[PDB]
């Protein structure tokens with residue numbers, strides 16, 4: 001079995017194909033604590049051991065430690081989160097080959113050439129042995145690594161003439177990464193990674209507006225408000241009974257304005273692109289400003305409506 | 321201004337393009353009551369008059385009256401719902417030209433030829449004069465009518481050879497309609513409309529499982545549960561604090577099995593199609609069973625991840 005894994009530091013996205021020809025997409029969050037969970041009843045908990053440390057999936061992990069999520073790519077917790085995503089995907093426990101991801105500035109050095117040291121480091125990370133209490137864990141065999149961004153734009157890149165170029169804008173949970181690649185993948189023109197802002201900027205604003213606990217527990221409510229920010233009818237029913245709808249709508253717009261200004265400022269660093277694509281979980285939050293501020297015809301502007309999965313699907317289309 | 325309007329009896333979907341080139345999509349429900357709403361405070365309410373009757377947008381309209389929604393297409397309420405959709409879209413009040421829809425079996429007679437009488441009736445419905453209390457209403461000038469289903473598959477159909485044919489499966493709020501069209505729109509091979517089941521079957525099952533009020537108010541909670549039915553993490557936080565996650569999950573699965581069995585039974589009435597497309601708000605609910613049970617390669621199976629808008633987007637691509 002071959003599983004494509006975009007192991008982001010906010011959510012692990014999986015994609016694979018079964019025997020009946022159905023193509024499956026699964027998402028599991030990066031939310032673990034460094035201790036086992038205690039269950040006195042029949043609640044299922046997931047308690048792991050890796051490198052001699054205990055970890056467990058935590059549904060209310062604190063939104064804390066909003067720092068270096070680059071180190072996370074080579075961490076013990078990353079190994080746990082990937083195993084946890086596999087364990088909760090619905091696939092049967094088996095040996096699996098996988099293809100994982102490295103952020104553009106980790107996969108590539110400043111010369112836009114493969115950073116072999118990081119690529120190997122990433123593969124080695126998955127050899128760390130893991131155990132699950134009360135169950136069998138999948139076994140990771142072959143590990144291939146793809147860079148983020150490019151796989152998402154590959155289908156389009158194949159169609160572009162070599163002198164044309166696609167600008168791929170990825171807004172993730174904690175970072176905003178942009179790359180410009182020549183048609184038919186004939187070269188990387190520029191990569192600009194930015195780890196100062198992500199969708200969590202908006203999520204944090206929402207949780208502050210509604211004074212929600214700063215944990216994973218309230219992440220769902222916050223995302224729903226954001227996703228349905230333009231539907232008063234939905235907001236009317238969801239918002240914690242009251243009508244702080246005004247104050248939340250306000251906080252959202254402010255964070256969104258920040259994201260939009262950042263992308264437009266960084267966009268000015270790029271030139272000569274002929275096509276534009278916006279991906280990642282936060283794509284819908286910045287697509288309008290980007291389209292408005294680029295001189296690119298509709299026909300050459302790409303955004304799907306399943307953006308958080310654009311990368312892993314591109315990876316699957318390439319390697320499956 | 322030209323607005324594309326898929327005026328379905330569950331939701332009105334709008335699509336248009338302004339000046340900056342941004343393409344806008346808006347959704348507004350069909351939920352009105354036959355009397356004005358009273359507001360003693362500053363809560364905005366929309367009170368209309370049309371054909372000599374008062375109607376008002378009602379956020380908690382009873383889910384009742386699951387009988388004939390076909391007549392709704394030529395009703396006074398349909399005129400109000402469309403004006404209400406326009407009033408809440410963000411567009412400025414003005415004269416507008418529009419293109420609306422008629423269900424396949426209303427647009428076409430049993431010989432699969434245009435039912436001019438229904439087409440004219442639809443156009444005339446919009447000449448009914450409407451008034452809003454406390455504000456101005458849009459003025460509808462030119463009215464064009466497109467049939468449902470075909471516009472959604474038009475992009476693909478243009479690419480098909482004349483001997484090939486696309487099967488378009490549309491699961492809406494209260495109906496499931498299927499059509500088979502020859503490549504390059506070279507003829508309609510078959511239309512099978514079914515008014516006995518829709519997405520509301522699953523919604524109703526969910527409301528009964530959580531004992532929610534049978535009104536529009538709980539529609540949002542019900543749809544979220546369905547949409548996130550495969551995410552225990554999200555369900556854990558959303559379900560009315562309890563743990564009927566088993567019992568609601570149970571009810572959904574049975575309603576979904578009923579929808580899947582119906583589509584598959586109706587599919588056996590069609591043959592010779594080479595490509596399949598699944599659309600409508602309920603597309604994600606039956607796509608797997610349909611893919612599983614057709615002998616059509618991945619490359620010839622079409623499903624977007626914005627299914628409730630496939631038809632109006634197709635309409636817009638044709639006439640904008």
Ligand SMILES: Nc1nc2c(ncn2[C@@H]2O[C@H](COP(=O)(O)OP(=O)(O)O)[C@@H](O)[C@H]2O)c(=O)[nH]1
Nearest residue numbers: 008009010011172173174199227280281282308
């Ligand atoms: N507003 C919005 N947020 C989304 C959408 N899809 C996913 N997200 C969220 O956007 C954030 C970014 O997730 P993702 O890009 O997958 O990134 P990662 O783990 O850094 O790769 C997450 O918190 C997601 O839950 C969407 O359609 N709209």
Ligand SMILES: Nc1nc2c(ncn2[C@@H]2O[C@H](COP(=O)(O)OP(=O)(O)O)[C@@H](O)[C@H]2O)c(=O)[nH]1
Nearest residue numbers: 328329330331492493494519546600601602628
């Ligand atoms: N499960 C699910 N329901 C959806 C989705 N998009 C829309 N819906 C719902 O599906 C139902 C059908 O809506 P729609 O097809 O637009 O039909 P209509 O007004 O009869 O045309 C509505 O209750 C929508 O809220 C989706 O992605 N998933």
Ligand SMILES: [Mg+2]
Nearest residue numbers: 008172173280
């Ligand atoms: Mg990512």
Ligand SMILES: [Mg+2]
Nearest residue numbers: 007008101102
């Ligand atoms: Mg990764």
Ligand SMILES: [Mg+2]
Nearest residue numbers: 328492493600
């Ligand atoms: Mg419809």
Ligand SMILES: [Mg+2]
Nearest residue numbers: 327328421422
């Ligand atoms: Mg209609």
